[PDB]
Amino acid sequence: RVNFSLLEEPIEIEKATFLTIKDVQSFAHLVKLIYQYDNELKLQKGLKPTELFVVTDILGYDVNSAATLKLIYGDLEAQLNDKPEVKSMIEKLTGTISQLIGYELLEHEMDLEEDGIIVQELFKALGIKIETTSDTIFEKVMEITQVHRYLSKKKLLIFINACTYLTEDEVQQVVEYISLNNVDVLFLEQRVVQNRFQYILDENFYLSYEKA
Amino acid sequence: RVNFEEPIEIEKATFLTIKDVQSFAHLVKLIYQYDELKLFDAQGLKPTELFVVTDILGYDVNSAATLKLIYGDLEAQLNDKPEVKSMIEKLTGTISQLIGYELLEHEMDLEEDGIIVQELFKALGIKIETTSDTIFEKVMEITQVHRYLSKKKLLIFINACTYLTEDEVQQVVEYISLNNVDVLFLEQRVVQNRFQYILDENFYLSYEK
Amino acid sequence: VNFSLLEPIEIEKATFLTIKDVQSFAHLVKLIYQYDGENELKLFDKGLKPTELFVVTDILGYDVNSAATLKLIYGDLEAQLNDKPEVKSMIEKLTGTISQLIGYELLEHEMDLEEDGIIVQELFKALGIKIETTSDTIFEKVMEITQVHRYLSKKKLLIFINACTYLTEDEVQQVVEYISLNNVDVLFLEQRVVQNRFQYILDENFYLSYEKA
Amino acid sequence: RVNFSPIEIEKATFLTIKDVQSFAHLVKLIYQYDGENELKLFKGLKPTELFVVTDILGYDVNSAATLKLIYGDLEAQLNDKPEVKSMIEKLTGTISQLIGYELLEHEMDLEEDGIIVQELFKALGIKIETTSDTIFEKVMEITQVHRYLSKKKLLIFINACTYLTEDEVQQVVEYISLNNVDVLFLEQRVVQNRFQYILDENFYLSYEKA
Ligand SMILES: [Ca+2]
Ligand SMILES: [Ca+2]
Ligand SMILES: [Ca+2]
Ligand SMILES: [Ca+2]
Ligand SMILES: [Ca+2]
Ligand SMILES: [Ca+2]
Ligand SMILES: [Ca+2]
Ligand SMILES: [Ca+2]
């Protein structure tokens, strides 16, 4: 994954790549570009607006949206498909509940009818979601990265200012996760992230791949 | 129970025929307009306490407000069969445990609440069966549903008795008696072989046969 | 359009069908309400989707002012307006003037405000444009349902059940009079004979005939 | 106004937290605001009285409840310019009648009520413009929105000053002091050239000019 704007040199986003932009205006501008994304070019084949995933507000980000739960539930059912001895138990438990309640409908004085219970119905009845209420920014960053692991239509996650919140070993565990799961993410910072390699465009317009 | 040209007393299944079509139309209008024509208790009826059907097969017996009342009642019936409820409680508990393990094995921080019996009712698709209904059956169903909707003091059917054999009518008239529900049947053709208020072409109020 | 259930009766314009036996009247009503295409009632052209069918028993209760009906009526209403261009341009010029004025008000306001335009539909919707139904008689409502049947091109067959029990002999004529004018196929289904007109009849012993009554 | 996890929020007030773990911890505390570990006082603040932004450009300024309030103010404005209101009502009036005849000649029994200004604003899609915003511009708009929502007693911007030059912050602060609202700027690095509370690398609170 490749982008270019004012640099006149293409930056390469492979796994977890850090881009620090010292001058606030140029940082405000690249940020504005990222939200207006459509100038600013993302690649070979140009990225579709819909394949970009941007977060600035880590805690406000809704990770339990309707679409994301759909995939999670899809995978949970799959996982449970591969454990026939468990799926089996579940089926017999739900079957029994249905016979049981079935009887009640009969003894009920109106003309009652039922279908049955499939696993998705169970996921929905259980209130299955990602836990977020007790999240630290670190725990949440991780949760956002994993949703990205899943959202295979989302080609690039850009974090903005996310590092201003994390301790240095915290940044390393996020990187280790991104490395290990073959996803690509850009951290866009205005202040240098300590003890690692990063692109830096400095107070003047000198682009370098230094370290801190 | 009391409604009014002359005051009429509605209790169990009562029949009102109007043979002059215009005055039948006019009354049916007034029935749909209700808020001019006045309906009383033992000594004032609010619109939400009145309930009307012309389209017997189209009426949704499975509407959410009614499904609530049946579910409530179905749960009460569970509650009063303590060994059965306990069986269900532990079976849904066991499910919640199993799925909960699966949550732990899944890579993300996953959470679940629990399964209560109303959720089971909604997951099974508990409703009143209607697909196979005959007009006759649907009238029976609608009538029961009238026993439950006790904020609905009076039920009016219009032209029901044109769909129904004189024997079905009597079934229904009885069934209504066993539930002590007040329902008015408004017709335009006399209902054969029974006592009905009649308002004839020449506007004479009769209690005939 | 055509039905068989037992043989076949063409329904062209305002056509009446009296089923004199109550068992059979009820059976057929059930068939209509259970209509899908795979089941035992058959309605033609050949073709006829359930989505294309349109049945009303309860007339006062029918919602003539639904969103999907109103979209069609507004559409017609737009066209009637394009057929009188001097009125049309006056509307465009008058909404134009509106938009400029409110525009200047967006400029003078502290905040950075933006508008787009007013198009006729938006005017219809701001006008509370609907069919008046509060004061309806059954007769009046029956006209409106017929009228709405006409504008819904997707609805090929309208069916009224027991409509003639609320309607005087004069009133019936006019519905038929309207129906013919507009080339819409509506079937009136009855249990009693309709006074003084041509109908199909199924008698208590199941002979079908086409008679005045 | 008053803050503790003991700080007085008045007009434009900045609070810098130097240890990232503290910062993180407080930001989280802000997103959980109920009345638990940290507290905001006039008497307590309800969570609907609170108003936090981190994602400036993402923030929906054009929400149904905010628009409600602009429209009322726009309407108020209109009413105060009676020559204009009078022109608008004539225009809507004439339109009403033209369509009026068209309904009378329509075959169906067609009915209309009328047009009031609020409906006018709605058919226009009156909204705050944001597609072209810079972060600065958006920051002004949100500050404006805060000025309309009497209900939110406090606005908290987090990391706002990583996107803003010294001169722009200064324009934001001029605006706020002037329209007199309470907005807290929570940062993790010192904002040049102004007074701000500072939490040291623990645990000392001081109120200096940087
Ligand atoms: Ca089910
Ligand atoms: Ca969590
Ligand atoms: Ca639950
Ligand atoms: Ca049934
Ligand atoms: Ca518009
Ligand atoms: Ca009317
Ligand atoms: Ca209006
Ligand atoms: Ca703007």
The CA distance from C129 to C121, in Å, is 10
Pick the residue of D16, D19, D20, D188 with the most A CBs within 10 A to test the interface with A by mutation: D20
Reduce the DSSP state of residue C52 to 3 states and report it: helix
Using the Cβ of C106 and the Cβ atoms of chain B, whether some distance falls under 8 Å is answered with no
Residue A61 and residue A139 in one domain: yes
The Cα B138–Cα B164 span in angstroms is 11
Choose the closest CB to A24 out of D53, D133, D164: D164
The alpha carbon of residue B52 is apart from the nearest alpha carbon of chain C, in Å, by 10
Q: How many domains does chain C have?
A: 2
How far apart are the C-alpha atoms of B160 and B52, rounded to whole Å?
Answer: 11
CATH of the domain at D16: 3.40.50.11940
Q: Residue B95: its chain A contacts at CB < 8 A?
A: 90, 93-94, 122
State the distance from the centre of ligand 4 to the C-alpha of D142, rounded, in angstroms: 58
Whether C46 and C149 map to the same domain: the answer is: yes
DSSP reduced 3-state for C53: strand
B96 and B133 co-located in one domain: no
Let me know the angle formed at the C-alpha of A117 by A115 and A119, rounded to the nearest 5 degrees: 150
Check the CA dihedral A74-A79-A82-A88 and report its sign.
negative
Looking up tokens 């008795």 gives B161
User: How far, in Å, CA of B127 to CA of A128, rounded?
Assistant: 26
Tell me the H-state helices in chain A.
Answer: 24-36, 66-81, 84-107, 119-125, 137-150, 168-180
Query: What is the side-by-side order of every strand in the sheet holding D39-41?
Result: D7-8, D2-4, D39-41
Q: Which chain D residues are within 8 Å of C132, Cβ to Cβ?
A: 109-111
Bridge partners (DSSP) listed for residue D155: D51, D183
Q: Establish whether the linkage from the previous residue to B15 is cis, with ω within 30° of 0.
A: no
Contact B158, B53 (CB under 8 A): yes
Reported resolution, Å: 2.7
DSSP states along B8-60 = EE--SEEEEEE-SHHHHHHHHHHHHH-----EE------GGGEEEES-TTTS-
Last residue of a domain, one of B125, B159, B177: B125
Q: Is C76 annotated as a binding residue?
A: no
Long-range contacts of D163-171 (CB under 8 A, 24+ apart): D163/A24, D163/A27, D163/A28, D163/A31, D163/A190, D163/D56, D163/D135, D163/D136, D163/D139, D164/A24, D164/A28, D164/D135, D164/D136, D164/D139, D165/A24, D165/A25, D166/D192, D166/D193, D168/D136, D168/D139, D169/D194, D171/D136, D171/D140
**DSSP β-bridge partners for residue D198:** D16, D206
Same domain, B154 and B198: yes
> What is the span of the domain harbouring residue B2?
1-63+126-209
Q: Is D53:D44 a contact under the CB 8 Å cutoff?
A: no
Spatial distance between the Cα atoms of C87 and D95, rounded to a whole number of angstroms? 10
Do A93 and A103 fall into the same domain?
Answer: yes
Most C CBs within 10 Å, among D71, D80, D112, to test the C interface: D112
Question: C96 and C21 share a domain?
Answer: no
Q: Token pair for residue B37?
A: 């024509």
Q: CB within 8 A of C104, min separation 6: which ones?
A: none
Phi, psi of A139 (to 5 degrees): -60, -40
Q: Are C37 and C49 in contact (CB under 8 A)?
A: yes
Specify whether the CB–CB gap between B77 and A108 falls below 8 A: yes
**Last residue of one domain, picked from the residues D110, D125, D140:** D125
CA distances to A16, D97, D106 from C121, rounded to whole Å, are 51, 16, 16
Give the list of residues 6+ apart from residue A92 with CB closer than 8 angstroms, or none.
none
Task: Indicate if C86 and C151 belong to the same structural domain.
Answer: no
| Distance, CA of C33 to CA of C29 (rounded, Å) | 6
Determine phi and psi for B14, rounding to 5 degrees.
-110, 145
A113 and A155 share a domain? no
Whole-angstrom Cα distance, residue C190 to residue C160? 9
Do residues D186 and D20 lie in contact, with contact meaning Cβ atoms separated by under 8 Å? no
Distance from CA of C2 to the nearest CA of B (A): 23
**3-class DSSP state of C16:** strand
Per-position b or e across C14-48, b if 16+ CB within 10 A of its CB: bbbbbbbebebbbbbbbebbebeeeeebbbeeeeb
What DSSP character marks residue B69? H
Within 8 A by CB and 6+ apart from B64, the residues are: none
CA-nearest of A145, A138, A201 to A170 is A138
Same domain, B75 and B140: no
Structure tokens at B165: 């054999």
Whole-angstrom Cα distance, residue B192 to residue B194? 6
- The residue in chain D having the minimum alpha-carbon distance to the alpha carbon of residue A35 is D57
Both A136 and A181 in one domain: the answer is yes
Nearest ligand to the C-alpha atom of residue C137? 6
User: Per the structure block, which two tokens stand in for B148?
Assistant: 């439950």
**Residue C188 in 3-state DSSP?**
strand
Q: What values do phi and psi take at C175, rounded to 5?
A: -70, -45
Task: Mutate one of D81, D86, D87, D91 to test the C interface: name it (highest C CB count within 10 A).
Answer: D91
A149 CB-near residues (< 8 Å, 6+ apart): A181, A183
Give CA–CA dist D76/D161, Å, rounded. Answer: 35
- Rounded to whole angstroms, what are the CA distances from A171 to A175, A189, A194, A210, C105? 6, 13, 10, 18, 50
- B182 Cβ neighbours under 8 A, 6+ residues apart: B1, B10, B11, B12, B14, B153, B154, B155
Shortest Cα–Cα distance, D178 to chain C (Å): 14
Structure tokens at C16: 């009446």
Cβ–Cβ contacts within 10 Å for residue A191, how many? 15
C213 is in an annotated binding site: no
Whose CA is closest to D152, among D76, D61, D75, D74?
D61
Q: What are phi and psi of B79, to 5 degrees?
A: -40, -40
Exposed e or buried b for every residue in D127-164, given b needs 16+ CB within 10 A? bbbbeebbbbbbbbbbbbbbbebeebbbbbbbbbbbbb
Q: What is the CATH number of the domain that holds B104?
A: 6.10.250.2340
Question: Which three-class secondary structure state does DSSP give residue A155?
Answer: coil
Q: Which of B202, B18, B188, B185 is nearest to C164 (CA)?
A: B188
Helical segments of D9-161, H only: 20-31, 64-79, 82-104, 117-123, 135-148
What is the whole-number distance in angstroms between the Cα of residue C94 and the centre of ligand 8? 28
Sheet with A156-160: strands ordered across: A52-55, A156-160, A185-189, A16-21, A199-201, A207-208
- Helical segments of C49-137, H only: 67-82, 85-108, 120-126
Q: Which residues surround ligand 1, an ion (CB under 5 A)?
A: A 115; B 125
Task: Judge whether B74 is closer than 8 Å to chain A, CB to CB.
Answer: yes
CA D105 to each of CA C80, C199, D111, D112, D188: distance values in angstroms, whole numbers, following the listed order: 10, 34, 12, 13, 70
- What torsion, rounded to 10 degrees, do the Cα atoms B60, B62, B64, B70 define? 140
Whether residue D193 is found in the same domain as residue D115: no
In chain B, % helix, strand, coil (3-state, to 5) comes to: 45, 20, 40
Q: Which of C128, C152, C181 is the last residue of a domain?
A: C128
Give one DSSP letter per residue of D150-193, joined into a string: TT--EEEEESGGGS--HHHHHHHHHHHHHHT--EEEEESSPPTT
Q: Which H/E stretch holds residue A112?
A: strand A112-113
- DSSP calls for B112-138: -----HHHHHHHTT-EE--TT--HHHH
Helical ranges in A42-118 per DSSP H: 66-81, 84-107
Method: X-ray
Tokens at C140, concatenated = 């009046």
Query: How far is the C-alpha of C9 from the C-alpha of C15, rounded, in Å?
Result: 10
A5 near A33, Cβ under 8 Å? Answer: yes
Closest CA to D149 of D26, D39, D50, D42: D50
Q: Is A167 on the interface with D (CB under 8 A)?
A: yes
| Residue D64 CB coordination number (10 Å) | 7
- Is residue B90 within 8 A of residue B80, CB to CB? The reply is no
**Rounded alpha-carbon distances, angstroms, from residue B51 to B142, B163, C56:** 11, 20, 19
User: φ, ψ for residue A17 (rounded to 5)?
Assistant: -120, 135
Evaluate whether chains D and B are touching (3 or more beta carbon pairs less than 8 Å apart): no
Q: Do D95 and C99 touch (CB under 8 A)?
A: no
After which residues is the backbone of chain D broken at C–N > 2.5 Å? Answer: 5, 42
Residues A61 and A72 in one domain: no
Asked if the Cβ–Cβ distance from B107 to A146 is below 8 Å, we say: yes
Distance B122 CA to ligand 1 centre (A): 7
Cα distance from N-terminal residue to C-terminal residue, chain C: 23
What distances in angstroms separate CA C184 from CA B99, C112, C140, C199, D183, one per listed residue?
A: 58, 53, 18, 17, 66
> What is the per-residue DSSP string for A116-137?
---HHHHHHHTT-EE--TT--H
Please choose, from the candidates B154, B162, B160, the residue with its C-alpha nearest in 3D space to the C-alpha of residue B180. Answer: B154
